[PDB]
Write a protein that binds this DNA or RNA. Structure first.
Ligand SMILES: O=c1ccn([C@@H]2O[C@H](COP(=O)(O)NP(=O)(O)OP(=O)(O)O)[C@@H](O)[C@H]2O)c(=O)[nH]1
Ligand SMILES: [Mg+2]
Ligand SMILES: [Mg+2]
Ligand SMILES: [Zn+2]
Ligand SMILES: [Zn+2]
Ligand SMILES: [Zn+2]
Lengths: 65, 156, 43, 160, 196, 84, 266, 130, 114, 559, 138, 47
DNA sequence: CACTCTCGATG
RNA sequence: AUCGAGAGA
């Protein structure tokens, strides 16, 4: 679907870091670990929260209705 | 020696030497007649059948034979006086308690024990995982197989 | 969906047992538990 | 086999003996062989025991075998249950099976025997032979929806 | 259920306070019992947890493919490099009291899935509902507000118990209780009972 | 025919089925506001009241025990021993 | 002062790493539990959807809206809707903010938390404003619209407790560790060979003295020093998270004391 | 009052798969026919090999256990390590050899002696010093 | 579907009082107090603070079931010392310690940067 | 069989079950919705007219309430649609169908109902959420976990039948079952592992926790037990505080291996007057054993006190365990390096032995055992060798495991797992088999196309050297898959044929009971047993006792 | 180009297959699994990859070679009961009943075969921070 | 992502499960049971 | 010969 | 309701 607004486990906001994450991956050409680190995601629950996410909405938007 | 029987006598005795707090350094106020004739008269009350004819009484003495062997074995004079060191009061309490528990241990008429047996065999037969054993053998037995898979002869 | 689209059914000496020849042709793990065990297979 | 034998001094001691196990059964001619003790010979076939040594020995062997099946799994069932089963299998005079050929051919109630395996044919031959159902059977009062003579209903309650 | 035949339903839900917590403040999304491990021998569950933990920390993707030379020792070394106990253990604190736990807890990410069986789709209760037409017995199905079969084996159980009146009640009042008239002669249901 | 009060061979102790049946019947009676033959002493539950009424042997019922031959022995609740 | 002591090791807008001294374990724990669960916060509790032609479901979006962190500075002068004498909600108890998004460009039109517009009257109170710690100033990515898709809805945010729903959680993860050397032996370490070598050494070990092998076990020692790190989400500044945690705990103790005071009535 | 008093020489210390409790084996330095076996919380009162521990059995110093307040209360010990248990067996090795078995919450004890006023009573305080 | 409302964790029900003080029949001079709409947060703290009072013989709290937000607190004090006074002293002690803790944290916060 | 011997009934419910440490043994958690649905007809009496009036006043939708009100005429008042549902003058003799309330007798059941303990009467406790909640120690007789299991509940509709449930089918009355003259319920899982952890000699408990545990027992006298340790710090042992859960007058004695009253290994068990003197408490004691603690407490104190005992033990042990914690990881499946080397070299010398026997047989020097083929002798030898290998390696791995090893801890407690689990996880899973033999030649003269023909080597015929920790090779994976497949097959077959056997047994022994002359007969009055069980005793009240006259020397007998 | 061949069981009878391409080559890790050295020479075929013996459902199982086979079977059964995005167009389909996970997540531990099963694109579950522990006993 | 391979009958997606059978035109020899008068049978299913 | 939910086409 | 199919323990 879409990037979860907050981390399930602890509650840290992560819904504002998805685009920044993608940019950190494509623009600065970083790896997932460093990208997740620079976004202040030290705990591996949030780290997971972003790394593990699949942005399915980007396919959902391919339909016209 | 270890066999399932009604009335746990050991627990009754160890409850006697706990309820009356008898010390192991004091002469018992019992008597040979008290113990011997007492135990001998206790067996007369251990009733399972209650007829008045010869047949039913014979069946009665037959049904309680084993438990009476246990009784005589546990409540022998030497054992009672030396090993148990019971008093008169404690001994009488033991006899009364044994009789009571024995009467409690009797099966209640109306007990659907056919179904009880069938389930007591069928249920553990569910948790079952060189002759044929286990479930297939049980099936052979119950079906009374004319031609069992592993006919064996044990010759001594 | 994928699992259902690659399924095998068998009507009716030991058709349930995972045979040696099933190697690389039929999944050794994927089979329903119970009555249809070993009969219903997956490619 | 290892065997517990009463010592002359009193206690029980492990006295090991050579025992002949066997693939194959022919009790009628093996026990009459000079050299072995024909009083302790045994076979897992309670059929041959029942045919050679009698219905009681057949009962003992039957129980021995059922109990063997139970205890082989490591489990334990009290004696009276298996004893009840074997006794019921053995009281008819021979070895009555626990199938539609065995106890279902007994002279009990029609409805009871019809509540198991062969249903309709039992009722057919019951109607053909004009059988009387005592209705003191469990399943028969189950069908009639009445308080069967079971435990609580094994008696009557009146006033005095 | 996990991805290793480890099925189980939710027993209860705890808020983050009542939940046990690591020194970092991380709280488990899920708590399973160690008694569901040794008998079933699902070691791959544990290895999946270790690997997923390391992959989570390093931001990489754990290769849990079948026949590879990836071993628990390498995963353990990698986890140790990230600053944790190499076997996935973490010192956790009891949520209720704040005091440490004596034994340390196997703690880490593990891929769990939600199965189609949920209580509110299963839960069923009927007290006198719609009957059938042929047998005049309770209909079959939760959606049709039906009853539950007091089957043969249940009957056998109640017989074994000796509870006769309960057996009769289950088979009459709680089901299809009918009153019929019987002829005193032939004993059939030929009786035409003109009541009133 | 019947069986005399003397030479009764059945158990002098009340079976658990007899107990459950008696308590159940008496509770059935009390549940329909029937007279109570014992002091309530705060008790309101018909089953409980039936139990207290059983302990004091104030239950005017009698058990008809059926032998397999058709014979029957009558045992009043007051006479039967309750050791359970 | 005279009682429990604090030592702020690190301090930022988002995190506070400090050391509690001269405190009982239960008080530190309870402070943690309060900081997690029982601090009042403002979050979206009601969502009225007019039009929603986006991919996501209504209550999906509503959920995401509920999780949005809003400014809860002057939350103590806002009121619970349940306590307010008004109908449903008003300005004294709730904060109403709208959201009107529509796909305009050919490309994907993102809907952020910044697009939320306060409609109700804040009347002076610093409240309701959605927290934006985002670098580009967008905030939480609420949704995505295509070309002709529209999202029109209204949000009523009410004062709430994280004990009721986690969306009212002012704090993230609270780091908590006492006795880094296990000198109290509250933990029997699992090992394969050498216990100390296998288990990683904590940072807080730098702040206490290691045990001497010549010394026996101190059986009379309790837990005094606690190393904590409180992280805020933005709704409430960290210092105010721990401070209002303390104030809340103290307040609900005082409520019990007051209850005792009231039970003396005939 | 007091029931038993002697000085024992710890001859052996055995941490039988434990890490807080050891089994100590000692003998009396007075009577040549008196020995002792005892489970000791080493974490509290460490017992090394070849130690001269002063051991005493008391009957007092039932009611619930109040916390040590203040005190300002007669402890009747000033020892180093005090336990409380229950005798459960009086084994008679010989006529000149009588042994007693005490159980201190699971920490067992076998005291073999000769001359005793140790009855099968709940009152069983074990006091060890130095 | 059968899940209770969340506010039932902290919002007092109809007729439910905060504290239910009951005389303990077991030991003399003992009391059991039922705290409604509270959990371990208050229970553990008060219990721990009651063990500091040397005139308190017994003090233990328990949550009989995690479904319901309530806990029982049993207190036994010495004779000539009402247990309610022990609870009050415990509460006041807690409040004072928390006030000092808050003040100290505040004065420590003002001396920080970033 | 479908409408007479059994049929669907009213006043029944069914739901996913879950365990609850805070429910009594004979209780059942009932969801509020179900409690609102299922009803009981209670006649209006002076004893309950107020309560019933209040219940009617609450009506449906609010628990506790009522659904219908039946008058003298027999007319049924629907309390959810009636205009007079607010004002009702309840007359005496009227019936009020009220909601199921607390402490109501209900028949709890799980299918398949194999024995009488599958249907037991529980006391209702209405609880939130939508699951039937039951006590853990009631799991065993029902045979039920909580991985999606559903159970049924039947509500009695009169006084006599609920009396039947409360006096005959009650759970405490079913603790010691006549099936195996032993208790069919015991302490399991967390309570068992935890009670093993608690009663260790190393386990001491300080004041606060002791007070909490003490208070956790509802049957506590309020008397603080004098601590096992006084100075230099008041400490209580696990056994000590656990003893509070055990009632007075309970004596339990059992010697294990080297148990000599002083028990250097803290094994065996001695409990004097409800106070455990010595011994680690685990499955042999607090489990569903023959002469265990539960059996004794049931026979001595009674069923009620035994159920309450289940309660107390569970509460204390679960409390301690909660604040102690217990886990399990891959580290508990890892043996030391040298241990793994010894395991590998053991499998090595095993394979070498098999190789030697193979080479011997191929040299036509293998003399066949009397009564079987040379090939069968070879197979027997090889299989025995590989089995000895697995067992050897497994025992090495087991020896290497420490007492802090969680798996080994659960094994010691008897809570879960056995030796073969440790063996197959850590050391070597061993030889796979199908139809009693090792993996047969599916292809001509070979098991897989990766082997050459006539390959009788261990790895070719399905021997798995590797353990689950190490990982299985493709061949090993497939062979183990074959074995496991056979397992599932014969499992379904087993449950089927057993399902039939049980029914046959039941239907055959159906109409048999004990009559009032202690004679075991049928519906025909035919004597099956003249005295039931040949002794006239109920199996429930029977315990294994030694006949110490049948043994010992004549000298000892005389002495 | 005669590089790959199609073989059914009947023809499989007459060939010798190498398990890994490293079985054609003419001090170790105690951690790694014990593998029998190739005692066969005359290879005619080599397995593409052994993990291809599994089906679609069992290809989701992480480390199935570290499991007991019936557990792999059970997981294979329960994988078809997990929720998640079954299709992207679920919103424009009128199926009898459908279940879509709120926030599907690609498993942290994957399989090389998952790549072809589109599992990382259409996952059926979430990575839950699991804790194996005896807590409250619930 | 839809892979096809199915039909759509009355708006309902349908999958044809692969049916397993014995290969025809194959000569197979089987040993018969002990009570059987014939000992071996060589059969073939012609297609 | 050995309790459920369910779906989905048929009279 | 009547027949097949999937699946839950
Ligand atoms: O001796 C025992 C001990 C335990 N068990 C219990 O059965 C399980 C393994 O034995 P099982 O084959 O009965 N597995 P089952 O419970 O039917 O299904 P699953 O949950 O998927 O494993 C174990 O996990 C125990 O719960 C036994 O059946 N027999
Ligand atoms: Mg299980
Ligand atoms: Mg289950
Ligand atoms: Zn997080
Ligand atoms: Zn007529
Ligand atoms: Zn308002």
């Amino acid at each position: 679907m879409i990037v979860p607004v907050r981390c399930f486990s602890c509650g840290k906001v992560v819904g504002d870091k998805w685009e920044s994450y993608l940019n950190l991956l494509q623009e600065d050409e970083l790896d997932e670990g460093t990208a997740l680190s620079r976004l202040g995601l030290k705990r591996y629950c949030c780290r997971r929260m972003i790394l593990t996410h699949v942005d399915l909405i980007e396919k959902f938007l391919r339909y016209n209705p | 020696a270890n066999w399932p029987l009604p009335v746990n006598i050991r627990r009754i005795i160890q409850n006697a030497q706990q309820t009356f707090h008898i010390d192991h350094t004091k002469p018992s106020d019992l008597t040979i007649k008290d113990i011997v004739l007492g135990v001998k008269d206790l067996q007369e009350n251990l009733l399972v059948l209650r007829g008045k004819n010869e047949i039913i009484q014979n069946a009665q003495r037959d049904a309680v034979t084993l438990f009476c062997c246990l009784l005589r074995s546990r409540l022998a004079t030497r054992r009672v006086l030396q090993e148990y060191r019971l008093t008169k009061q404690a001994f009488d309490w033991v006899l009364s308690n044994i009789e009571a528990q024995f009467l409690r241990s009797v099966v209640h008429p109306g007990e659907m024990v056919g179904v009880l047996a069938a389930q007591s065999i069928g249920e553990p037969a569910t948790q079952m995982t060189k002759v044929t054993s286990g479930v297939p053998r049980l099936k052979e037995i119950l079906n009374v197989a004319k031609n069992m898979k592993t006919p064996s002869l044990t010759v001594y | 969906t994928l699992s259902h689209l690659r399924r095998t059914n068998t009507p009716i000496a030991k058709p349930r047992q995972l045979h040696n020849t099933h190697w690389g042709l039929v999944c050794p793990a994927e089979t329903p538990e119970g009555q249809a065990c070993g009969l219903v297979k997956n490619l | 086999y290892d065997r517990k034998v009463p010592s002359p001094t009193g206690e029980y001691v492990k006295e090991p003996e050579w025992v002949l196990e066997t693939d194959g059964v022919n009790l009628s001619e093996v026990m009459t062989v000079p050299g072995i003790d024909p009083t302790r010979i045994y076979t897992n076939s309670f059929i041959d025991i029942m045919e050679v040594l009698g219905i009681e020995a057949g009962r003992a062997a039957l129980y021995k075998e059922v109990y063997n099946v139970i205890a082989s799994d490591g489990s334990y069932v009290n004696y009276r249950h298996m004893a009840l089963l074997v006794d019921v299998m053995t009281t008819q005079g021979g070895l009555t099976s626990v199938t539609r050929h065995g106890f279902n051919r007994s002279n009990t109630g029609a409805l009871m025997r019809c509540s198991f395996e062969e249903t309709v044919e039992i009722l057919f031959e019951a109607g053909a032979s004009a059988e009387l159902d005592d209705c003191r059977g469990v399943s028969e009062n189950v069908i009639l929806g009445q308080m069967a003579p079971i435990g609580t209903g094994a008696f009557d309650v009146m006033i005095d | 259920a996990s991805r290793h035949g480890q099925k189980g339903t939710i027993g209860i839900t705890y808020r983050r306070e009542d939940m046990p917590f690591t020194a970092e403040g991380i709280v488990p999304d899920l708590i399973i019992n160690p008694h569901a491990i040794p008998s079933r021998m699902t070691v791959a569950h544990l290895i999946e947890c270790l690997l997923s933990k390391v992959a989570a920390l390093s931001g990489n993707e754990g290769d849990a493919s079948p026949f590879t030379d990836i071993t628990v020792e390498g995963i353990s070394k990698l986890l140790r490099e990230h600053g944790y106990q190499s076997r996935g253990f973490e010192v956790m604190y009891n949520g209720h009291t704040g005091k440490k736990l004596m034994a340390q807890i196997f703690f880490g990410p593990t891929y769990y899935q939600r199965l189609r069986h949920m209580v509110d789709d299963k839960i069923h209760a009927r007290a006198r509902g719609p009957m059938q037409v042929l047998t005049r017995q309770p209909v079959e199905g939760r959606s049709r507000d039906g009853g539950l079969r007091f089957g043969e084996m249940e009957r056998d159980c109640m017989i074994a118990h000796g509870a006769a009146s309960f057996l009769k009640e289950r088979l009459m009042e709680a089901s299809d209780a009918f009153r019929v008239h019987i002829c005193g002669i032939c004993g059939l249901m030929t009786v035409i009972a003109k009541l009133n | 025919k019947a069986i005399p009060k003397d030479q009764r061979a059945t158990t002098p102790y009340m079976t658990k089925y007899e107990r459950a049946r008696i308590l159940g019947t008496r509770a059935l009676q009390i549940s329909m506001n029937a007279p109570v033959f014992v002091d309530l002493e705060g008790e309101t539950d018909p089953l409980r009241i039936a139990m207290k009424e059983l302990a004091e042997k104030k239950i005017p019922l009698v058990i008809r025990r059926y032998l397999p031959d058709g014979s029957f022995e009558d045992w009043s609740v007051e006479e039967l021993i309750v050791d359970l | 002062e005279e009682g429990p002591q604090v030592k702020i090791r690190e301090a930022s807008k988002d995190n506070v790493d400090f050391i509690l001294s001269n405190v009982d374990l239960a008080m530190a724990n309870s402070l943690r539990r309060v900081m997690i669960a029982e601090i009042p916060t403002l979050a979206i509790d009601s969502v009225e959807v007019e039009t929603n032609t986006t991919v996501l479901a209504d209550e999906f979006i509503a959920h995401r809206l509920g999780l949005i962190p809003l400014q809860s500075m002057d939350i103590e002068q806002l009121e619970y809707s349940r306590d307010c004498f008004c109908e449903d909600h008003c300005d004294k108890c709730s904060v109403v903010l709208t959201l009107q998004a529509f796909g305009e460009s050919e490309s994907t039109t993102n809907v952020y938390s910044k697009d939320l517009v306060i409609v109700s009257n804040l009347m002076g109170r610093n409240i309701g404003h959605p927290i934006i710690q985002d670098k580009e100033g967008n905030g939480v990515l609420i949704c995505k619209l295509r070309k002709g898709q529209e999202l029109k809805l209204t949000c009523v945010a009410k004062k709430g407790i994280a004990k009721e729903h986690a969306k009212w959680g002012p704090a993230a993860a609270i780091e908590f560790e006492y006795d880094p050397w296990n000198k109290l032996k509250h933990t029997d370490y699992w090992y394969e060979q050498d216990s100390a070598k296998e288990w990683p050494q904590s940072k807080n070990c730098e702040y206490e003295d290691p045990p001497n092998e010549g010394d026996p076990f101190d059986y009379k020692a309790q837990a005094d020093t606690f190393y904590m790190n409180v992280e805020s989400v933005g709704s409430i500044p960290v210092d105010q998270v721990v401070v209002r945690g303390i104030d809340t705990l103290q307040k609900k103790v005082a409520s019990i004391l007051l209850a005792l005071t009231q039970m003396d009535q005939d | 009052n007091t029931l038993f008093d002697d000085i024992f020489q710890v001859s052996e210390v055995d941490p039988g798969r434990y890490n807080k409790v050891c089994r100590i084996e000692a003998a009396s330095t007075t009577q040549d026919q008196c020995k002792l076996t005892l489970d000791i919380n080493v974490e509290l009162f460490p017992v090394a090999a070849q130690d001269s521990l002063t051991v005493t059995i008391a009957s007092s110093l039932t009611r619930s256990w109040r916390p040590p307040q203040a005190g300002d209360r007669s402890l009747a010990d000033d020892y180093d390590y005090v336990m409380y248990g229950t005798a459960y067996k009086f084994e008679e090795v010989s006529k000149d050899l009588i042994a007693v078995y005490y159980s201190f919450g699971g920490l067992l004890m076998r005291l073999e002696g000769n001359y005793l006023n140790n009855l099968k009573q709940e009152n069983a305080y074990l006091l060890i010093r130095r | 579907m059968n899940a209770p409302d969340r506010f039932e964790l902290f919002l007092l029900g109809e007729g439910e009082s905060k504290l239910k003080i009951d005389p303990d029949t077991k030991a003399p001079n003992a009391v059991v107090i039922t705290f409604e709409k509270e959990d371990h947060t208050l229970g553990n703290l008060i219990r721990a603070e009651l063990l500091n009072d040397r005139k308190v013989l017994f003090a233990a709290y328990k949550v009989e079931h995690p479904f319901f937000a309530r806990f029982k607190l049993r207190i036994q004090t010495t004779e000539g010392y009402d247990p309610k006074d022990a609870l009050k002293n415990a509460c006041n002690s807690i409040i004072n310690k928390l006030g000092a803790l808050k003040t100290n944290f505040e004065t420590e916060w003002n001396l920080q940067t970033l | 069989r479908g409408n007479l011997m059994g049929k669907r009934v009213d006043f029944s419910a069914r739901t996913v079950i879950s365990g609850d440490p805070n429910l009594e043994l004979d209780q059942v958690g009932v969801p509020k919705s179900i409690a609102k649905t299922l009803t009981y007809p209670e006649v209006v009496t002076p004893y309950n007219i107020d309560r019933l009036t209040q219940l009617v006043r609450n009506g449906p939708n609010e628990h506790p309430g009522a659904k219908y009100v039946i008058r003298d005429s027999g007319d049924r008042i629907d309390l959810r649609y009636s205009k007079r549902a607010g004002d009702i003058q309840l007359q005496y003799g009227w019936k009020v169908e009220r909601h199921i309330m607390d402490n109501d007798p209900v028949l709890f059941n799980r299918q398949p109902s194999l024995h009488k303990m599958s249907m037991m009467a529980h006391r209702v406790k209405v609880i939130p959420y939508s699951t039937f909640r039951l006590n853990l120690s009631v799991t065993s007789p029902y045979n039920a976990d909580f991985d999606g299991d559903e159970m049924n509940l039947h509500v009695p509709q009169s006084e006599e039948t609920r009396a039947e449930l409360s006096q005959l089918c009650a759970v405490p009355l079913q603790i010691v079952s006549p099936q195996s003259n032993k208790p069919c319920m015991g302490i399991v899982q967390d309570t068992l592992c935890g009670i093993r952890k608690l009663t260790l000699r190393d386990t001491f408990i300080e004041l606060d926790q002791v007070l909490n545990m003490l208070y956790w027992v509802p049957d506590w006298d309020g008397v603080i037990p004098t601590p096992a340790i006084i100075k230099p710090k008041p400490l209580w042992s696990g056994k000590q505080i656990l003893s509070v859960a055990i009632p007075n007058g309970i004596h339990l004695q059992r010697f294990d291996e080297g148990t000599t009253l002083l028990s250097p290994k803290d094994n065996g068990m001695l409990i004097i007057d409800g106070q455990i003197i010595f011994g680690v408490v685990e499955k042999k004691t607090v489990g569903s054993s023959n002469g265990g603690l539960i059996h004794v407490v049931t026979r001595e104190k009674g069923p009620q006190v035994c159920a309450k005992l289940f309660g107390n033990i569970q509460k204390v042990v679960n409390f301690w365990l909660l604040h102690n914690g217990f886990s399990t990881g891959i580290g508990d499946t890892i043996a030391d390096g040298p241990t793994m080397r010894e395991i590998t070299e053991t499998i090595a010398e095993a394979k070498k032995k098999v190789l030697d026997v193979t080479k011997e047989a191929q040299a036509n020097l293998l003399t066949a055992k009397h009564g079987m083929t040379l090939r069968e002798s070879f197979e027997d030898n090889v299989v025995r060798f590989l089995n000895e290998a697995r067992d050897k390696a497994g025992r090495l791995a087991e020896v290497n495991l420490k007492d802090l090893n969680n798996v080994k801890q659960m094994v010691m407690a008897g809570s879960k797992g056995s030796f073969i689990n440790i063996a197959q996880m850590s050391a070597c899973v061993g030889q796979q088999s199908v139809e009693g033999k090792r993996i047969a030649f599916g292809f001509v003269d070979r098991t897989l196309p990766h082997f050459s023909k006539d390959d009788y080597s261990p790895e070719s015929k399905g021997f798995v050297e590797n353990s689950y920790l190490r990982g299985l090779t493709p061949q090993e994976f497939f062979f183990h898959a074959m074995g496991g497949r056979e397992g599932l097959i014969d499992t379904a077959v087993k449950t089927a044929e057993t399902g039939y056997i049980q029914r046959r047994l039941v239907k055959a022994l159906e109409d048999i009971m004990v009559h009032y002359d202690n004679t075991t007969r049928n519906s025909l009055g035919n004597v099956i047993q003249f005295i039931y069980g040949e002794d006239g005793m109920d199996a429930a009240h029977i315990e294994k006792q030694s006949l110490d006259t049948i043994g010992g020397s004549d000298a000892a007998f005389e002495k | 180009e005669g590089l790959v061949e199609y073989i059914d069981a009947e023809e499989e009878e007459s060939i010798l297959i190498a398990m890994q391409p490293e079985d054609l080559e003419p001090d170790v890790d105690p951690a790694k699994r014990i593998r029998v050295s190739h005692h066969a020479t005359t290879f005619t075929h080599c397995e593409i990859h052994p993990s291809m013996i599994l089906g679609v459902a069992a290809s989701i199982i992480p480390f199935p070679d570290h499991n007991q086979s019936p557990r792999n079977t059970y997981q294979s059964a329960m994988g078809k009961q997990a929720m998640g995005v079954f299709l992207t167009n679920y919103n424009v389909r009128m199926d009898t009943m459908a279940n879509i996970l709120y926030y599907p997540q690609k498993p942290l531990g994957t399989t090389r075969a998952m790549e072809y099963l589109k599992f990382r694109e259409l996952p059926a579950g979430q990575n839950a921070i699991v804790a194996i522990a005896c807590y409250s006993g619930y | 992502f839809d892979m096809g391979g199915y039909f759509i009958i009355n708006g309902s997606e349908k999958v044809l499960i692969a049916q397993e059978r014995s290969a025809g035109n194959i000569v197979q020899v089987f040993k018969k049971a002990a009570p059987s008068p014939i000992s071996h049978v060589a059969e073939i299913r012609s297609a």
